[PDB]
């Protein structure tokens, strides 16, 4: 199924720069909202035309 | 060689049924059964005398 | 390739001299004013497909 | 019935009539898992007779 | 019927009976939560691999 | 020549007594990248595996 | 004791040590080695995002670079655990037995 | 996924709330390797029961599963980040094994 992030015409400030997923948590953190920023794995790949 | 050390640092694992007490008892038993400390002590005493 | 590398003259058109480089200024303002505008369209049958 | 409690982590147990006590909880948990799994069926209506 | 008609944007019309059915079992509706979970799983094993 | 045998033997003794096992397949599975028939890979995963 | 420049009953280490405990979490950033690896990976990340230092890359390798660095940072190997807990014990056991 | 986390919670310590009726049965000190092996066994059993041949949970199975969690985020150039954490729904298998 589709998976998109918003398209910005020329507003540089809103250009996406990282998409990350997590599959675990750090040593003591138990709340995903807190460990997400440091336990994420960047995802993406360019394709040539 | 840095490469070997890095590989060792990134690819370590334990046996999935490790019990430290049993493992280390088995490890120590023959090592101490084949000790040579006492002969070394006697040799050291001879060396100082000489 | 990254947003960090956008040249300052590109976001601020005035930096390009209308006299020393008219073609580049024309091209920049054309890009700013006529680049396609994104939009969106509804789809799907959420009541069953989620 | 010892063979039902030595199928997860008893890869070191030399004797075929022995099992490691420390694996008992893991083995029991596994056994319960497939106990549930093997019973995932819908009871069917066959037919009767007076 | 409604879902298929909606998905095709009206270009295709399907029909369903209007009668006392025999309450067949067709389990296909799930909450959005597990759809998102499965989508995350699908994304997580595709990263950086053209 | 005097010192080398001592270090080599001690290193072997550590290797044969530690529970730690070195297994690069951990690295290989974590990367999980093949990229067959890529004359110009220019991919970080392939280079780091190399 | 054959110690010369050290107190007779002590053995020096270049790494801090902790009591042995197998149940330790892998991603325990308290461990110095794991924290070091995380710091190095984060530094390389911060180096590579904005492409300020890699001109002449035709394609934006930022995503793949960051993904690889994240995989290395969070690789769940058990070597630092062993180095922090078990290895000093083995060294302490062996040392008095050595001929030298 | 939920069945995996529930079963692993019994032999190791995790962050999710969970009941415990098998504490009187003796058990070892679970390590990362033990957890990985247990998770692999669970995955194999689940795949067998439902007649699946392709991958299931292997994306999770890499390394230590004792602290699994699912979330996804993305970041703009200006630093604003957006998180999506799916609030994990129920499970009949986990509840039934809990009852058993």
Whether the Cβ atoms of residue A22 and residue A43 lie closer than 8 Å to each other: no
- Which residues of A, range 2-41, sit inside 8 Å of H by Cβ? 5, 12-25, 30, 32-33, 35-37, 40
- Which residues of B, range 25-44, sit inside 8 Å of H by Cβ? none
Whether the Cβ atoms of residue A23 and residue H68 lie closer than 8 Å to each other: yes
Q: Does H96 reach chain G within 8 Å, measured CB to CB?
A: no
Rounded Cα gap, residues G92 and B7, in angstroms: 25
Write the residue in A3, A23, A45 that is nearest to E39 by C-beta: A3
Distances from the Cα of H9 to the Cα of G49, H16, H67, H98, angstroms: 38, 8, 9, 12
Helices and strands, number each (H, E), in chain D: 1, 0
Q: Would you list the DSSP string of E22-38?
A: ----------HHHHHHH
Q: Does D35 reach chain H within 8 Å, measured CB to CB?
A: yes
Write the residue in G21, G23, G76 that is nearest to H63 by C-beta: G76
| Farthest-apart Cα atoms in chain C, separation | 62
User: Which residues fall within 8 angstroms of residue F49, CB to CB, at 6 or more apart?
Assistant: F27, F28, F31, F33
Q: Does H72 reach chain G within 8 Å, measured CB to CB?
A: no
Residue with tokens 């529930």: H6
Residues of H in contact with G23 (CB under 8 A): 12-13, 29-31
Q: What number of other Cβ atoms are within 10 A of residue F2's Cβ?
A: 5
Rounded Cα gap, residues G25 and E38, in angstroms: 27
Please list the residues that pair with H83 across neighbouring strands: H73
G20/B20 touch (CB, cutoff 8 Å), yes or no: yes
Q: Do you know the residue count of chain H?
A: 100
Judging contact as 3 or more Cβ pairs under 8 Å, the answer for C and D is: no
G70/A45 touch (CB, cutoff 8 Å), yes or no: no
Rounded Cα gap, residues G6 and E1, in angstroms: 85
Rounded Cα gap, residues A24 and H39, in angstroms: 15
Q: Say what the resolution is, in angstroms.
A: 3.3
Whether the Cβ atoms of residue E42 and residue E27 lie closer than 8 Å to each other: no
The C-alpha of A20 sits at a distance from chain C's nearest C-alpha, in angstroms, of: 17
Sign of CA dihedral G64, G69, G72, G73: negative
Whether the Cβ atoms of residue D20 and residue D30 lie closer than 8 Å to each other: no
Write the residue in A3, A46, A47 that is nearest to E43 by C-beta: A3
Which of the other chains make 3 or more beta carbon contacts under 8 angstroms with chain H? A, B, D, E, F, G
Q: Does E6 reach chain C within 8 Å, measured CB to CB?
A: yes
**Starting at the edge strand that comes first in sequence, how are the strands of the sheet with H71-75 ordered?**
A41-42, A18-22, H71-75, H81-84
Select from E27, E30, E35, E40 the residue whose CB has the most chain H CBs within 10 Å, as the one to mutate to test that interface: E40
Q: Does H93 reach chain E within 8 Å, measured CB to CB?
A: no
């Amino acid at each position: 199924p589709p998976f998109q992030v918003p398209y910005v015409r020329l507003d540089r400030d809103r250009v996406p720069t990282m998409v990350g997923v997590t599959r675990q948590s750090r040593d003591t953190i138990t709340q995903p909202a807190l460990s997400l920023s440091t336990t994420n794995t960047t995802v993406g790949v360019p394709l040539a035309l | 060689d840095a490469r070997a050390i890095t590989v060792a640092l990134l690819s370590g694992k334990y046996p999935p049924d490790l019990v430290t007490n049993v493992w280390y008892a088995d490890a120590i038993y023959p090592m101490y059964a084949d000790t040579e400390v006492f002969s070394n002590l006697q040799r050291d005493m001879i060396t100082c005398e000489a | 390739s990254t947003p960090h590398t956008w040249p300052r003259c590109f976001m601020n058109i005035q930096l390009i001299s209308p006299i020393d480089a008219p073609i580049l200024r024309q091209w920049a303002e054309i890009i700013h004013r006529y680049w396609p505008n994104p939009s969106q369209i509804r789809y799907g049958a959420p009541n069953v497909f989620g | 019935n010892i063979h039902l409690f030595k199928q997860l982590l008893n890869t070191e147990t030399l004797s075929v009539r022995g099992a490691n006590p420390l694996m008992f909880r893991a083995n029991v948990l596994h056994m319960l898992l497939e106990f549930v799994l093997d019973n995932l069926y819908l009871n069917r209506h066959t037919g009767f007779s007076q | 019927e409604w879902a298929l008609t909606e998905c095709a944007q009206g270009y295709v019309t399907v029909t369903s009976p209007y009668a006392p059915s025999v309450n067949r079992l067709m389990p296909y509706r799930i909450s959005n939560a597990e759809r998102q979970i499965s989508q995350i799983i699908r994304i997580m094993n595709i990263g950086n691999n053209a | 020549t005097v010192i080398q045998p001592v270090l080599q033997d001690i290193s072997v003794l550590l290797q044969r007594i530690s529970p730690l096992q070195i297994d690069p397949t951990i690295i290989s599975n974590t990367m999980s990248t093949v990229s067959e028939s890529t004359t110009q890979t220019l991919s970080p995963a392939s280079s780091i595996l190399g | 004791s054959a110690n010369l420049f050290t107190p007779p009953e002590v053995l020096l280490l270049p790494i801090d040590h902790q009591p042995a405990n197998v149940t330790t979490p892998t991603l325990d950033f308290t461990n110095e080695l794991t924290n070091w690896r995380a710091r190095v990976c984060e530094l390389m990340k911060n180096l590579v995002d904005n492409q300020r230092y890699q001109p002449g890359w035709t394609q934006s390798l930022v995503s793949s670079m960051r993904g690889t660095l994240d995989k290395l940072k969070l690789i769940k190997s058990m070597t630092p655990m062993y180095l922090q807990q078990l290895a000093p014990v083995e060294l302490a056991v062996i040392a008095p037995m050595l001929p030298f | 996924v939920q069945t995996l986390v529930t079963l692993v919670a019994q032999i190791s310590e995790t962050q999710y709330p969970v009941d415990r009726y098998l504490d009187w049965i003796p058990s070892l000190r679970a390590s990362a390797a033990t957890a990985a092996t247990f998770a692999e066994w669970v995955n194999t059993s689940m795949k067998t029961a439902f007649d699946l041949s392709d991958m299931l949970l292997e994306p999770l199975l890499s390394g230590d599963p004792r602290m699994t969690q699912l979330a996804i985020q993305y970041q703009q150039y200006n630093g604003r980040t957006f998180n999506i954490i799916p609030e994990m729904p129920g499970s009949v298998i986990a509840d039934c094994v809990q009852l058993t």
